C-alpha cells in the first residue's frame, strides 16, 4: 500500500501548454500587452530555446520522483504563504446547530466526538479504510489515499521564510496518545490511553468535566498563547523562537505538536445562531475577546464544541483537501448516532489521573507579541465580509434533466454573476482533483473561458438584441468548454502545474528570472479574483473559506437535489467587492439561466 502502481502524473506537451495559456489570457489582458506576451511565449517555446531545455529537465524529474509537482505545489500553494492561517488559508466545516440545555450536554457531545475519532483512527492505523474508487464510463479506478494518513499525524511549523509540514515521528514505541483540549484559552493534555486500555465515552466525559472545572478557575489562568498561532507566519516564527528559550514552553509545544487533534470548548456567543453567525465563529472565533484565542492553527484538525451549540471543524489545508476532510467528518458524525441499545458500551475504570494543564514561561518579549497578535486578529475579524447564501429555487435534478453537469452549470453561472457586476471576466480558480495519480492533490480549471465570455455578453449586453435560440446555443458551447477543461484537468493535462514546474526548474538553473515568468500577463494569470470549489455533502453541514487576493472573492458551494448552498467571502477593505451583492448576482444568474432552458 504505497501506491507504487498508480499512474504517475503526466507531463503535458510544451506547445500545447503554451497554446492553451495564450488562449486563456487573450480576453483578460489589454490588446497591446497580449501582443508582447505572444512574442515572449514564442521566444520561450522556439526550437532549442529555454522552454525545451526546461521540459527535458522536467521529464527527468518525472522519472526520479513519484510526483514531479508535489514539492513545488506544496510550497507555492501553502508553505510559502506568509498570510495568517485564519480566513486566508484554513477552511472550516460547520455542523448543524446543536441543542445543549446545559454544560453536560456539550461535554457528552464532545466525549462522543473524541470517541469517534479514536475509532476512525483505529481503522486507519490498521489499513482497514476502504479504498476510494473513481466511477468511469468503461470502468473505475483506485484513487490515492495518502491524504487520510495525514489527518491526525500532521503539524505545520512556522518558518521565517518558509513553513514546514511535519509528519509525526511515530518511531517512539507505544506511549500515551493524547488530544489537547482548549477551554478559556487554557490548554490541557487528555490521555486517550492508559495501560493497554482506551478510555470509554464515560471516562472522557469525566475527564472533560475536570478540565472545565480547572479552566473556569480565574486564580490560575495562564496567558492566551494560542493567539500567537493566529498571526502572520513570519511573526509567529519569531514569537515561537522566543518561546523555545525556556524549557517549560519547549515541553508544552512538544505536547501540542504530538497530539491527535484539538477539541475546543468555546464559550457562548451573542445574537441569532444563523448559518452565517456559526461560520464566523469557526473561521476566526470572533477575535481574542471571544473565542479567537481558544485555538492553535498549526494543528491540522480543530474540532469546536461550543456551549451554545455552535459546532464544527477548522482545519489546516496544507496536508489534505476538502473531499477527504468531508469523508472523515461524515464518517464521524454518522457514528455519533449509530446503533446502541446494548448494556453500557463503556468501561468506566478506577480513578484516572487528572488531565494536566500546559504551562508557559511568559517574558516581556512574548507579552509584546501577544498585544501585536491581538490587534492583528481583530483586523481580520473586522475585514471579513461573509455570507451563507441558500439558493432554494432548484438544484441538481433540474440541471441534470437539461443534460448538463451541475458543476459546470454552476461555474458558468458564477462567470455570469461576475460579468453582470463588473462587465469583464477575471482569472478564476476551480479546484480539480488529480488523485488518480501518485500523491495527487489538485490542479486548476480556468472557468473564465472565451466561450463563457461569449455567453455572458449575450446574456447581459443584448437588452433584447438577440433571440433565445442563440443564447441557448452559446450556453451549450460554454458548457462544452467547461466539461472539456474539467476532463483535461483531472487527467493531468491542464496548464497550472506544468507552468509551475517549468518556472521552479528555471529558478534553480537560471542565473536570471526568465522573461516568460516576469511577464505581467503571467503574474495576472495567477491572481485569482474568483477562487472557487465544490464541496458536496450527504448531510447537514457546509465548508467555507476566505478570498486569496485583497480584491477577490472566495466561493464554496454545496449542490443538493433541490437546492444549492453558496458560501461567499470578500474583504471590506476593498471597495469594489461586496459578498451580499455577488450572492444576489449568483442567484439572479441561476434564475436567468433556468428561464433560458425553459425557452427550449
Ligand atoms: Na468589500
Swiss-Prot record:
A single GO cellular-component term on record: synapse
Keyword Acyltransferase tagged: yes
EC number from the UniProt entry: 2.3.1.6
GO BP terms, alphabetized: acetylcholine biosynthetic process; adult walking behavior; antral ovarian follicle growth; chemical synaptic transmission; dendrite development; establishment of synaptic specificity at neuromuscular junction; memory; muscle organ development
One Gene Ontology MF term: choline O-acetyltransferase activity
Domain of life: Eukaryota
Residue list for modification Phosphoserine: 348
Coiled coil: none
EC class (word): transferase
Keyword Acyltransferase tagged: yes
Pfam families xref list: Carn_acyltransf
Positions of CoA binding: 395-407, 433, 534
UniProt-annotated catalytic positions: 317
Keywords: Acyltransferase, Neurotransmitter biosynthesis, Phosphoprotein, Transferase
Reactions accelerated catalytically: choline + acetyl-CoA = acetylcholine + CoA
Protein family membership: Belongs to the carnitine/choline acetyltransferase family.
Complex and partners: Monomer.
Function: Catalyzes the reversible synthesis of acetylcholine (ACh) from acetyl CoA and choline at cholinergic synapses.
Protein name: Choline O-acetyltransferase
Organism name: Rattus norvegicus (Rat)
Gene responsible for this protein: Chat
